């Protein structure tokens, strides 16, 4: 189905004169495969997947050099932004960068992203057309003018439409056993009387890939949507994910409530009830 | 693969 490749970068200034922290991670769809950590003893781009280990030494050297270049760019950006916002050198701040490309199942270019944030707020982002920028405040406008004068959006367009898609296809082929797989959810429902007349039903879906999944509660044929305790999709640590959703129901009325499950690995949607 | 271009200081 639809596929995507995205890179995430986090750089944190640490209060004092200490070497700032830098962590880079790479994902194909919902599977992590590369990482870099400035506090690690390797100081190289490391693999976190079986199929990415087959790449040659020139690949790892180039990735190491490029991720180091990202790290140094963020090193400069911390002080630069600190000066932009008149912040003190006694505090700790954070720069975040994310970029990648999404395809439309047929492995053709669909979307491209490059976003940049200082602390936890948006700073600047490349628009959909990959030729214009969105600046958040009046210093991000200075950065925006600088990047327009240097034609950054053109280079990022060339990467997002060209190299990103090529290597996304190459990654999808190498390790097709893992990336192009689909794990069906293993589900069950639990009933708990919170009091004498009280009840609540938890709908559990486990060990599914990809992470996109839909669990909803329906009462007497119509969806409730708002009356539920839905949690964020979480990883199990083995490449699969878990998700559950609870609903409050009166005792003896558990059969009014049904749980509907939708996932790629299920050719037909599923419906569960308190059996 | 990482981007070898388009990474400019703010």
């Amino acid at each position, epitope marked *: 189905g639809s596929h995507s490749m995205r890179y995430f970068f986090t750089s944190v200034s640490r209060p004092g004169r200490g070497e700032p922290r830098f962590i880079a991670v790479g994902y194909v769809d919902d599977t992590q495969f590369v990482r870099f950590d400035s506090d690690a003893a390797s100081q190289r781009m490391e693999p976190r997947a079986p199929w990415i280990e087959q790449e040659g030494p*020139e690949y790892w050297d*180039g990735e190491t050099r*490029k991720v180091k270049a990202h790290s140094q760019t963020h090193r*400069v950006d911390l002080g630069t932004l600190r000066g932009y916002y008149n912040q003190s050198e006694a505090g700790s701040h954070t720069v975040q960068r994310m970029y990648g490309c999404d395809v439309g199942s047929d492995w053709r270019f669909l979307r491209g992203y490059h976003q940049y944030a200082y602390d936890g707020k948006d700073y600047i982002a490349l628009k959909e057309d990959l030729r214009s920028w969105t600046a958040a405040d009046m210093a991000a406008q200075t950065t925006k003018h600088k990047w327009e004068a*240097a034609h950054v959006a053109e*280079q990022l367009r060339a990467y997002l*439409e060209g190299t990103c898609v090529e290597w996304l296809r190459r990654y999808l082929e190498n390790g097709k056993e893992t990336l192009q797989r689909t794990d069906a959810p293993k589900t069950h429902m639990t009933h708990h009387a919170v009091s004498d007349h009280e009840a609540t039903l938890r709908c559990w879906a486990l060990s599914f890939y990809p992470a996109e999944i839909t669990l909803t509660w329906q009462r007497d044929g119509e969806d409730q949507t708002q009356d539920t305790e839905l949690v964020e999709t979480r990883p199990a640590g083995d490449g699969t994910f878990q998700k559950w959703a609870a609903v409050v129901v009166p005792s003896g009325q558990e059969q009014r409530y049904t749980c509907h499950v939708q996932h790629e690995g299920l050719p037909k949607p599923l419906t569960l009830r308190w059996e | 693969e990482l981007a070898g*271009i*388009g990474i400019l200081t703010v």
Partner: T-cell receptor, first 102, second 113 residues
């Protein structure tokens, strides 16, 4: 490392189309440059190319195919002032920009 | 206008002496490069520097020192000049790593015994 062009020297008569080529080792290369160096001068940037395909700059044309690790430059209406050493530069990630023999 | 400048453009050295080629650039470029060209080949990468404060070792780093104390300057230092270091040294600079590099005027350097 490993950037190699047509060794040369080559000869093209005045007014004709000339063609230079260049290959590299790193498949992940994403930016490529053609420079012009007269004897005793510094490299003057002719062109750059990043995306696959062709790019037109006046009399000069750049072609790039990452699938075979290939880049090339075509010159229309070869003028006597075009006689020079043409350099092929490939970026190998970061600041490791490698030039061919010219 | 803004550009890039090397200094000197010519220097003769007695083997054993020390000499530093200065290179500066005004146009707010982050990346800077030091190349060595021997006229029997093309130029090879001596050193590079992605940002101000950081440096990198390249294709031919043996025997050369560098420093990137600030954005504008990226000098190349030869500590113990040997006759095999006779070459033409070029400095370059670029906005970002991987972008187009702009060269200076060059430096014809000849070390004699």
């Amino acid at each position: 490392k490993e950037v190699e062009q047509n060794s040369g020297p080559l000869s093209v008569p005045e007014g004709a189309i000339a063609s230079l080529n260049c290959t590299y080792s790193y498949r992940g290369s994403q930016s490529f440059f053609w420079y012009r160096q007269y004897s005793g001068k510094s490299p003057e940037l002719i062109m750059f190319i990043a995306s696959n395909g062709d790019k037109e700059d006046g009399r000069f044309t750049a072609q790039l195919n990452k699938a075979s690790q290939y880049v090339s430059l075509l010159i229309r209406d070869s003028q006597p002032s075009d006689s020079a050493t043409y350099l092929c530069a490939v970026n190998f990630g970061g600041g490791k920009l490698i030039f061919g023999q010219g | 206008i803004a550009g890039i400048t090397q200094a000197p453009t010519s220097q003769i050295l007695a083997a054993g002496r020390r000499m530093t080629l200065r290179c500066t650039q005004d146009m707010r470029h982050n990346a800077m490069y030091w190349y060595r060209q021997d006229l029997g080949l093309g130029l090879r990468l001596i050193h590079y520097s992605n940002t101000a404060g950081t440096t990198g070792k390249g294709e031919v780093p043996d025997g050369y020192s560098v420093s990137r104390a600030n954005t504008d300057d990226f000098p190349l230092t030869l500590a113990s000049a040997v006759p095999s270091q006779t070459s033409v040294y070029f400095c370059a600079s670029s906005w970002s790593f991987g972008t187009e590099a702009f060269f200076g005027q060059g430096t014809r350097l000849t070390v004699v015994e």
